[PDB]
Amino acid sequence: HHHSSGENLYFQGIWDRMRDGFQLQDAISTNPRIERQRLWFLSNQSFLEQSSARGSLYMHYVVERLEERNMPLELALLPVIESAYNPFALSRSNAAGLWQFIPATGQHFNLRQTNFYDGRRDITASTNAALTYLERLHDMFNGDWMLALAAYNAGEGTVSRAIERNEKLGLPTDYWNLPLPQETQDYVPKLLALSQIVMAPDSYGISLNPINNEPYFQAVRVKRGIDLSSVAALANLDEDELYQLNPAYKRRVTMDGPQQLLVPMEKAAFLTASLD
Amino acid sequence: HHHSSGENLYFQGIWDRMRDGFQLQDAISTNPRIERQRLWFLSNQSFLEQSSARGSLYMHYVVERLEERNMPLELALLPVIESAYNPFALSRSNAAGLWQFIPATGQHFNLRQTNFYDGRRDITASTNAALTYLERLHDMFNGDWMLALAAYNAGEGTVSRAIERNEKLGLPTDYWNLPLPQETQDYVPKLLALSQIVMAPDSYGISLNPINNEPYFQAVRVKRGIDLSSVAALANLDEDELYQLNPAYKRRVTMDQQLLVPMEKAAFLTASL
Ligand SMILES: CC(=O)N[C@@H]1[C@@H](O)[C@H](O[C@@H]2O[C@H](CO)[C@@H](O[C@@H]3O[C@H](CO)[C@@H](O[C@@H]4O[C@H](CO)[C@@H](O)[C@H](O)[C@H]4NC(C)=O)[C@H](O)[C@H]3NC(C)=O)[C@H](O)[C@H]2NC(C)=O)[C@@H](CO)O[C@H]1O
Ligand SMILES: CC(=O)N[C@H]1[C@H](O[C@H]2C[C@@H](C(=O)NCCS(=O)(=O)O)[NH2+][C@@H]2CO)O[C@H](CO)[C@@H](OS(=O)(=O)O)[C@@H]1O
Ligand SMILES: CC(=O)N[C@H]1[C@H](O[C@H]2C[C@@H](C(=O)NCCS(=O)(=O)O)[NH2+][C@@H]2CO)O[C@H](CO)[C@@H](OS(=O)(=O)O)[C@@H]1O
Ligand SMILES: CC(=O)N[C@@H]1[C@@H](O)[C@H](O[C@@H]2O[C@H](CO)[C@@H](O)[C@H](O)[C@H]2NC(C)=O)[C@@H](CO)O[C@H]1O
Ligand SMILES: [Zn+2]
Ligand SMILES: [Zn+2]
Ligand SMILES: [Zn+2]
Ligand SMILES: [Zn+2]
Ligand SMILES: [Zn+2]
Ligand SMILES: [Zn+2]
Ligand SMILES: [Zn+2]
Ligand SMILES: [Zn+2]
Numbered sequence: 334h335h336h337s338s339g340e341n342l343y344f345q346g347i348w349d350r351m352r353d354g355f356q357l358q359d360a361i362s363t364n365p366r367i368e369r370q371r372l373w374f375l376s377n378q379s380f381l382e383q384s385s386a387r388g389s390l391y392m393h394y395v396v397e398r399l400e401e402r403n404m405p406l407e408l409a410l411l412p413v414i415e416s417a418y419n420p421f422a423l424s425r426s427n428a429a430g431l432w433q434f435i436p437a438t439g440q441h442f443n444l445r446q447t448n449f450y451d452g453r454r455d456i457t458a459s460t461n462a463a464l465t466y467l468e469r470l471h472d473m474f475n476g477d478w479m480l481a482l483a484a485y486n487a488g489e490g491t492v493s494r495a496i497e498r499n500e501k502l503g504l505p506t507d508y509w510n511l512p513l514p515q516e517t518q519d520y521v522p523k524l525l526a527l528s529q530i531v532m533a534p535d536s537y538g539i540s541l542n543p544i545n546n547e548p549y550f551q552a553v554r555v556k557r558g559i560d561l562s563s564v565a566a567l568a569n570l571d572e573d574e575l576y577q578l579n580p581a582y583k584r585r586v587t588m589d590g591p592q593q594l595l596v597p598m599e600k601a602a603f604l605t606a607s608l609d
Numbered sequence: 610h611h612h613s614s615g616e617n618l619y620f621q622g623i624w625d626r627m628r629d630g631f632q633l634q635d636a637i638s639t640n641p642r643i644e645r646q647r648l649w650f651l652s653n654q655s656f657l658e659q660s661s662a663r664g665s666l667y668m669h670y671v672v673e674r675l676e677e678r679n680m681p682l683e684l685a686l687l688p689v690i691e692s693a694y695n696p697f698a699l700s701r702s703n704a705a706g707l708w709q710f711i712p713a714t715g716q717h718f719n720l721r722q723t724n725f726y727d728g729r730r731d732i733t734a735s736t737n738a739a740l741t742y743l744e745r746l747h748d749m750f751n752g753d754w755m756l757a758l759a760a761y762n763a764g765e766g767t768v769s770r771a772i773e774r775n776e777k778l779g780l781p782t783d784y785w786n787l788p789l790p791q792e793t794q795d796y797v798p799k800l801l802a803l804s805q806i807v808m809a810p811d812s813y814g815i816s817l818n819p820i821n822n823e824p825y826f827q828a829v830r831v832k833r834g835i836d837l838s839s840v841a842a843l844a845n846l847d848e849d850e851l852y853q854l855n856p857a858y859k860r861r862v863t864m865d866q867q868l869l870v871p872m873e874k875a876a877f878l879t880a881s882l
């Protein structure tokens with residue numbers, strides 16, 4: 334119960350703002366599995382740097398959504414481990430977008446999947462769905478964020494079955510003792526290790542890319558037959574940047590999508606007035 | 610039902626959109642207490658009409674917040690019964706804003722209360738706090754929205770103590786069997802009755818005030834303490850309308866960084882401020 338309710342506008346950078354809402358640091362065990370993931374980040378330092386530079390487009394939005402819901406701000410780092418904040422990322426299980434929704438879970442959250450539009454890549458739709466899913470999982474596991482994260486990665490069924498197996502054997506049923514697939518064994522310590530580094534990067538000899546505490550994009554209502562090319566030309570925008578903000582459109586063809594477009598803040602007023 | 614933003618253009622108005630996200634209709638009992646509240650609304654029809662006219666400023670925002678959290682859209686009616694969608698409404702217990710936060714609960718959610726600023730009246734801050742509170746209450750009562758609503762009105766402690774009392778007596782512990790203060794006895798059936806009317810207004814001989822399924826306002830960044838009078842003059846806005854959208858400011862001086870403005874002036878004010 335650290336509710337900010339809109340005073341976090343005063344923070345200079347996004348990292349400080351994120352740190353303000355961290356909720357999982359108090360209870361971090363010193364399980365060696367966390368140390369193991371911490372070393373991975375230190376020895377692959379370009380991973381966080383590249384994720385941060387891409388993340389600069391999206392992180393402000395993610396942070397504000399988490400704050401509004403009073404959810405742990407460590408979850409603003411979840412796309413780092415899921416997708417390196419690359420919304421075009423696609424796993425071999427066909428997990429898609431920043432939040433790595435598989436097709437069936439995406440479908441459950443009404444993240445539409447056509448040949449030209451994939452709602453799982455849509456920044457705003459996918460983020461709100463992911464936070465809703467995470468909240469639901471947390472509720473299903475009696476408020477335990479470790480089990481919720483495990484279930485996000487492995488599925489609620491897998492985690493529940495692991496719990497019941499341990500109950501029958503007379504083993505403890507906390508996340509750390511569950512016999513989960515290796516990916517899920519690594520998943521939670523990975524997030525915890527990364528959050529420790531983000532909390533105190535100096536202490537690991539790391540420097541984070543400065544990211545300002547300001548919105549990068551604004552949603553603009555548009556018409557049906559307006560191409561990204563046309564919007565780019567109209568506002569003298571970099572078409573690559575527009576695509577990175579609107580990655581749901583495969584082949585950059587604006588078909589099959591909602592009548593909303595994310596545009597850079599500095600051109601938002603012009604495009605609002607021009608298109609709407 | 611999880612809501613996608615592609616359904617939105619097809620909705621006629623906000624009432625259709627609201628109904629789409631209703632989650633509490635399936636399990637509404639036919640307890641006489643609900644019928645009793647339903648009759649009150651039918652015999653005092655101006656109540657919902659006045660609430661709807663005020664609500665036209667705010668309802669779209671509330672609906673979108675509820676959708677993105679997959680929370681019951683019946684909760685978009687909670688400000689009707691709490692405040693008639695009037696953010697200046699103030700109970701004798703000093704419950705304030707659309708969502709009627711009392712001082713201590715407001716404080717808990719960091720809704721600041723000075724002689725010049727009351728965060729409880731702030732549309733976006735109060736709404737997000739209320740939804741968070743409601744979600745937390747729902748979680749505390751094992752997903753039961755009846756108990757959550759009762760707790761919103763009476764407090765978590767009161768409801769928990771009523772449940773424990775019934776357990777010891779060997780009574781069921783569902784909302785309907787708790788002997789709560791009369792306000793809280795009426796509170797939940799009031800919301801359910803109103804949602805039934807909104808769900809099928811034809812069936813009660815009611816026609817709801819048309820409200821478009823479009824945003825009324827947009828948030829605009831301001832980096833300084835500007836007067837709302839100055840903003841109103843700059844954009845040729847009615848100062849009253851600006852105040853209704855930004856009711857937290859007693860002194861209208863701001864100083865106390867986001868400002869809600871009518872959609873049609875949003876681009877101009879974004880560029881100007
Ligand atoms: C002489 C005469 O008869 N004059 C008529 C006026 O009475 C009438 O004004 C309206 O009257 C009704 C009372 O029947 C009143 O309804 C009340 O509205 C408030 C909300 O503002 C509710 O209070 C909230 O209740 C919840 C609990 O459920 C609390 O959690 C919340 O904190 C309370 N909020 C506040 C601010 O106190 C009351 O419960 C509700 N009473 C009910 C449903 O019985 C209307 O507000 C009055 N409206 C106005 C504009 O005054 C008028 C019609 O407008 O007609 C006159 O003739
Ligand atoms: C957000 C999301 O879609 N989560 C789903 C998850 O995806 C995981 C899968 C993982 C992934 O794609 N791993 C494969 C990596 S590799 O390409 O094979 O190396 N990434 C996603 C988010 O963590 O898979 C499990 C299990 O199917 C699903 O549980 S279910 O309810 O039982 O279906 C769960 O819903
Ligand atoms: C959102 C909110 O602030 N809810 C609070 C609620 O307010 C209620 C009070 C009621 C109200 O103002 N009633 C009095 C009306 S009258 O003017 O006296 O007739 N309206 C508000 C929202 O439902 O009062 C209870 C009990 O104190 C609080 O529980 S506590 O945890 O035990 O403090 C609860 O937090
Ligand atoms: C398969 C692989 O090596 N992917 C790279 C990993 O670092 C990482 O993989 C992601 O692992 C998550 C579990 O920790 C999965 O939930 C997620 O789906 C998976 N993502 C992808 C695209 O395979 C991510 C980004 O860090 O992709 C690669 O970079
Ligand atoms: Zn709290
Ligand atoms: Zn803080
Ligand atoms: Zn669901
Ligand atoms: Zn919950
Ligand atoms: Zn919790
Ligand atoms: Zn069990
Ligand atoms: Zn819907
Ligand atoms: Zn629920």
Ligand SMILES: [Zn+2]
Binds near residue numbers: 849850
């Ligand atoms: Zn006026």
